[PDB]
Amino acid sequence: SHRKFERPRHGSLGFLPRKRCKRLRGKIRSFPKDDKEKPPHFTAFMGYKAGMTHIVREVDKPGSKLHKKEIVEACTIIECAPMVVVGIVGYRETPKGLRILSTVWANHVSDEFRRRYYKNWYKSEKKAFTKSLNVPEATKNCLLKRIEKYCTVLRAICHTQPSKTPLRMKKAHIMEVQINGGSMKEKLEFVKEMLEKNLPVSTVFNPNEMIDVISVTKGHGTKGVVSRYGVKRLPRKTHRGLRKVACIGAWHPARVQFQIPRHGQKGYFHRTERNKKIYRIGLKTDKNSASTDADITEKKITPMGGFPHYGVVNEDFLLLKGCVAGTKKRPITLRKN
Amino acid sequence: AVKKVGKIIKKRTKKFTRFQSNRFMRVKPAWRKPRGIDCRVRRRYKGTNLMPSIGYGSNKKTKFLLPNNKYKYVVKNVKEMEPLIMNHTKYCVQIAHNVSSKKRKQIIERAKQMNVSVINAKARL
C-alpha cells in the first residue's frame, strides 16, 4: 500500500554512480558554445586550491535589507601560475562524434611537461618528445593547413607549471582549452602566435566575471548510508544497529532497485559547479595583492603563517567568491560560462 | 539411423541409455523402463531418451551373425570345436576368456586346419 506520509527521496540520482573519479584532474564535459563574432579567446584555465579567507565588501543592492552596509564573504584562493601553451588539436564533426584530425606540437616542451608521460621519470632516460620535435616547418604548416581546411573545433594543449607552486608533484597537468571565437583561420593564427609562450590568468578571465569550476571533491572512503545519503537514523532500540535503511525495497520486484541508498564510496567525486564570481585577480608582480583602497597596507594574499596544508602563494591567483570542491593542493579547472 | 552392410541391416546403433543416467552417478546407464507418474520419457515427450521397443528388432534372417556373416561360437577347448567341422562356412569361433596359452595355441591350430575363422586369434601372445 501507499506511504503514510510522503517525503522526497534521499539524495540525487543525477550524480550516480557515486564511485571514485577516474582521474584527479577536473575534466570539462563540454566547452561553452562557440560564437563566431567574438575574437578568438581561451575558455578554460587550471589552478590549485590554496585555501580560503574572508573579505569585506560594500553591497549595492537597492531594496535589499543590506544595501549600503559592508558584509563579510568567504572566498577561495586559487593559485594560478601561468600555463604554457604547447600544442594544437583540431576536431572535425562526424556522425560518430568529434574526430581528431591531428595534433601538432611546439618546437620545445618543458621537462615538466614531459614528466607527465612517465611513471618513473627519475630512472628513465627521458626520451619522450625528443625526435618528433625536429619535424620540418613544411609538414607542420601542411598539417596546420589541413586543420584549417577541415576542422571545426580548435583546442590548445596547455600545461601547468607545478614548480612555481609549493606542490611536491613535479609532472605538469595537461589539458586542452577550446579556442572559442572567430573563424577557423583566425583561431589557428591566434593559437599559433602564442604556441610556446606563457598563458596568464589575466588573458583568460577578468575581474567580476562569473565562471564555473570543475574539480574532484574531497575523498572520504566508504561511508555509511546515513552520512552518504542523509537517511534518517533508526530508533535507539534497533536490534542489529540503527545506522541503516530499514526497508530496501518492496517484495516485488524481487530485486533491489538502483534507487535505494546503500553504503559505499563518499567523496572523491567529479563536480562541475556553476557561477563562482571572481572577486580579484591578484598578480605575482605586485606587493599589495591583498591590499584594498580602504586598507592601503602593504600585504600579500598568503595569510600570516602560510596557507595551512598548502604553502605560500607566490604566483598569480584569483579570489573566488564562495567555496570550491576539493582539498588543498587540488587541481581546479576554471571554465567560462 | 539405420546402417547397412550388405544384407545386414542394424535398425539402430547407439544403444538406449537410462533416463537421467547422464546427470546422476547413482543411476547407471543400463536401460530401465521408467515406471514413473509424470515421467516424460514414459509419456514419450518429444526430444528425450526414447525407449526400446520390439519394432527395432533386426531381420531374423541376419539376426545373430557378426560382420563376417558368421555366427559366433565360443569354445573352451579343442573338443568343443568338433561340430564346426561341417559348419565352417557359417560359424566363426571365439576362444573363451579364461583359456590358457597352450589351449589357446592348440585351438588356433585346430581351427586353422579346420579352416574356421577365429575372432580373438591374437590374444595372450
Partner: protein
C-alpha cells in the same frame, strides 16, 4: 544473394519491408551494407511514429535501467534493431546473420564509390498510396534525440557534388568509347559486323 556484398541505398524504402528483405538475405548468407539509413520512410504520420517511439522509450527495467532495453537513436541503429527483431538473433546462426549486416547514415568512404542497389518491393513510391501519411526516419530520430541530421545532410550535399563530377567524366568517357566503337565497326570483317548487328551489338 550470390554477390560478395550488396550495398543498398535505404533512401525512400519502408522500414519494415526493407528489414524483412534484409533479414531474409542475411539468413540465406548474403552480406549487405545499408547506407543512407536516415532517409528510410515509415508509413503513418510523424507524430504517430513519435508516439510509438515514446512508448518504446518509456520501457526500462525499473530495478536497473542499464540492463533495460537499450533504445538507440541513430536511424542506422533503428534499422539494425528492426532487422534483429526480424531475425533469430539468440542462436549462433542467427547471430552470424545479424553480424553480416552493416548500417550507415550517409555514405562513407568505401560505399560511396560502389554500386548501390534498391529493393522495389520496399519503396514508398510503390507501397504507399500517395494520399496517406508517412514519416522520415532521420526526422523522427532528430525529434527523439539524435541531433546529427543536419551534419549528415551537408556531408550528403558534398558527396553529391563529387558524384556529379564523377558522372560528367564517366559520360564523356562513354561518348568517347562509343565513337571509337562506331568507327571500329567499319573495320571488322563484314561477317563479324553482320553477326553483331543481327544480335544487337
Amino acid at each position: 544473394m550470390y554477390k560478395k556484398e550488396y550495398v543498398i541505398d535505404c533512401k525512400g524504402h519502408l522500414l519494415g519491408r526493407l528489414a524483412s528483405l534484409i533479414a531474409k538475405e542475411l539468413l540465406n548468407g548474403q552480406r549487405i551494407v545499408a547506407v543512407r539509413c536516415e532517409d528510410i520512410n515509415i508509413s503513418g504520420s510523424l507524430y504517430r511514429n513519435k508516439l510509438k517511439y515514446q512508448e518504446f522509450l518509456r520501457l526500462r527495467t525499473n530495478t536497473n535501467p542499464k540492463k533495460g532495453p537499450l533504445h538507440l537513436r541513430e536511424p542506422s541503429k533503428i534499422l539494425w534493431r528492426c532487422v534483429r527483431g526480424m531475425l533469430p538473433h539468440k542462436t549462433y546462426k542467427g547471430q552470424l546473420a545479424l553480424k553480416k549486416l552493416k548500417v550507415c547514415v550517409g555514405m562513407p568512404y568505401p560505399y560511396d564509390k560502389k554500386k548501390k542497389y534498391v529493393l522495389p518491393s520496399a519503396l514508398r513510391a510503390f507501397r504507399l498510396k500517395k494520399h496517406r501519411r508517412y514519416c522520415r526516419l532521420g526526422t523522427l530520430s532528430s525529434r527523439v534525440g539524435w541531433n546529427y541530421d543536419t551534419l549528415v545532410k551537408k556531408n550528403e550535399v558534398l558527396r553529391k557534388q563529387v558524384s556529379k563530377a564523377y558522372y560528367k567524366k564517366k559520360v564523356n568517357n562513354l561518348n568517347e568509347k562509343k565513337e571509337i566503337k562506331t568507327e571500329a565497326l567499319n573495320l571488322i570483317n563484314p561477317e563479324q559486323r553482320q553477326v553483331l548487328e543481327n544480335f544487337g551489338y
